[PDB]
């Protein structure tokens, strides 16, 4: 019955601490889209993160690898798989919850002037290792991801044309302000107020 929608921005967010909270929203009937999926971070060193992804790639059905586990190298597909394994997705109540999620690298064009939110507990500056982390985009570019320069471009062009739209809006707030402080303005509105 619910029809609420939320856009979540992942730029300085620990990837595990965000996934556990995004999955509890999906189970309670909320639609989520996560943008800028290549900017989530992993606490620690790049040598520790590459060793853990290398053991993941080793898992493979010897009899027939086409049946076997599938290793995704795109940041939007990889972070979607971390949210899926937070929950029981084989059962029908979990199939529905996964129908309410969307993920993107960068910011797509339709979501241009709508407000975004961050999760209050996943900021990397609350841990004891601020300034030692790896982004999800640098780790995955070392295993095959190609479109890392085309994602930084698309985000900055939208940021700049979302900043100009704020200058037009702010100046009208000053031109409307002077009109509210007028003479023929008030004596008009005091008449409409007069007829309740």
């Amino acid at each position: 019955e619910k029809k609420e929608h939320v856009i979540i921005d992942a730029t300085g967010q620990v990837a595990g601490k965000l996934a556990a909270k995004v999955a509890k929203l999906l189970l309670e009937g909320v639609r989520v889209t996560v943008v800028c999926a290549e900017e989530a971070v992993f606490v620690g060193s790049l040598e520790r993160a590459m060793d853990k992804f290398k053991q993941y790639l080793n898992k493979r059905c010897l009899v027939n690898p086409r049946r076997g586990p599938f290793h995704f190298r795109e940041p939007r597909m990889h972070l979607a798989k971390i949210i899926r394994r937070m929950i029981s997705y084989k059962k029908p109540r979990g199939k529905a919850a996964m129908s309410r999620l969307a993920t993107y690298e960068g910011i797509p064009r339709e979501l241009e002037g709508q407000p975004r939110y961050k999760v209050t507990c996943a900021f990397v500056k609350y841990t004891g290792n601020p300034n030692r982390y790896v982004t999800l985009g640098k780790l995955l570019s070392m295993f095959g991801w190609k479109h890392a320069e085309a994602a930084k471009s698309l985000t900055d062009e939208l940021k700049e044309r979302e900043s100009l739209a704020s200058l037009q809006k702010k100046d009208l707030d000053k031109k409307i302000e002077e009109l509210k402080t007028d003479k023929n303005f008030e004596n008009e509105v005091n008449r409409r107020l007069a007829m309740l």
Binding site: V63, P65, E105, G106, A150, A151, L154
Partner: protein, 363 residues
């Protein structure tokens, strides 16, 4: 358990699964790297396989190295290549998900062989052209043209239905690539304007079909000894108890041939026209490029042709795709050809030039 006497495995897993090809004209997987400091050219062509012959060649070593000059006899393949026609332009831009294709520019009049390939044999039952040209110039990271063959000039195929493809345009200045192809719509481009003699080339095609084949032929395993019950053409053990399943790396019986294959580093030897005398040889006679009696199971060569060294994928009358090299090439040794054989390939032919047969018997 531990298996004394090791040997290599039989066959390659690079090409498993071994299915039929889904098409007779496979599309190229990659294109060379653009160097935008050259003039604009094309990177490929489509031709048709005719047959094989000889050539004798002088190995240039005539310096006083202990072998001045050797003779070398080499096998070659001939392909018949009529000129192609351009009828469209295509651009691709770059996104976060990769290459996105822009709307297409068609010329003014699309041929009747291009409409049978697109809509079947029973198909007969503006400024918007100018707006689409501006997009391929603002956007469009890379550019390609749409070309088609002219199979009705080789009347031993019996087609009327053309093969069409997209070929990348190399040479710099994306606005220069477009204006070079705008002055080429509806006209022809010949194979002598693409490849040149003594260059390395790639070929792409489909192999000769053989049907359902046993495992001695598909993979090359041993036969069993003569005393053996239940046949000798087979593999004896298909696995261990555990894992309790058959593996994808075991050899089985099935389809052999009619596969898609790409071959590389084939050297070009000659480029000519079939309706004239082949020369640049050091003997006197005239000799067109076609043997006494004709190429077996093929007619004569009457259009342009190209000659390359060695074997070439596929069967006679099937279409092949030619591509420029993707690697780094050094020079190529100097090529000196001095004889091309044109005896009969049916039986053991002993004459060149049927007038030479006529003067042996008298009458």
């Amino acid at each position: 358990s531990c298996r004394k006497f090791n040997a290599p495995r039989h066959g390659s897993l690079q090409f498993c699964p071994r299915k039929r090809s889904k098409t007779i004209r496979p599309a190229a997987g990659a294109f060379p790297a653009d160097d935008r400091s050259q003039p604009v050219h094309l990177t490929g062509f489509m031709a048709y396989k005719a047959g094989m012959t000889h050539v004798v060649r002088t190995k240039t070593q005539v310096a006083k190295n202990k072998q001045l000059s050797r003779e070398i006899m080499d096998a070659v393949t001939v392909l018949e290549a009529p000129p192609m026609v351009v009828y469209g332009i295509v651009g691709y831009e770059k996104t976060v998900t990769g290459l996105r294709r822009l709307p297409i520019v068609t010329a003014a009049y699309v041929s009747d062989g291009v409409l049978r390939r697109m809509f079947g044999n029973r198909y007969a039952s503006g400024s918007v052209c100018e707006s689409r040209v501006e997009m391929i110039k603002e956007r469009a990271h890379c550019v390609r043209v749409l070309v088609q063959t002219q199979p009705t000039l080789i009347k031993g195929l019996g087609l009327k239905k053309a093969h069409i493809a997209e070929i990348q345009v190399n040479g710099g200045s994306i606005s220069e690539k477009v204006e070079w192809a705008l002055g080429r719509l509806e006209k022809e481009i010949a194979i002598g304007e693409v490849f040149g003699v003594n260059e390395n080339i790639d070929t792409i095609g489909v192999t000769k079909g053989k049907g359902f084949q046993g495992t001695v032929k598909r993979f090359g395993v041993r036969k069993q000894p003569r005393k053996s019950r239940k046949g000798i053409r087979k593999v004896a053990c298909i696995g261990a108890w555990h894992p309790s399943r058959v593996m994808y790396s075991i050899a089985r019986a099935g389809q052999m041939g009619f596969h898609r294959r790409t071959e590389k580093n084939k050297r070009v030897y000659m480029i000519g026209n079939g309706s004239s005398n082949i020369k640049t040889e050091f003997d006197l006679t005239e000799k067109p490029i076609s043997p006494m009696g004709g190429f077996p199971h093929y007619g004569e060569v009457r259009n342009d042709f190209i000659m390359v060294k060695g074997a070439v994928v596929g069967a006679r009358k099937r279409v092949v795709t030619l591509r420029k090299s993707l690697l780094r090439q050094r020079a190529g040794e100097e090529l000196v050809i001095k004889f091309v054989d044109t005896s009969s390939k049916i039986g053991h032919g002993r004459f060149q030039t049927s007038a030479e047969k006529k003067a042996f018997y008298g009458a």
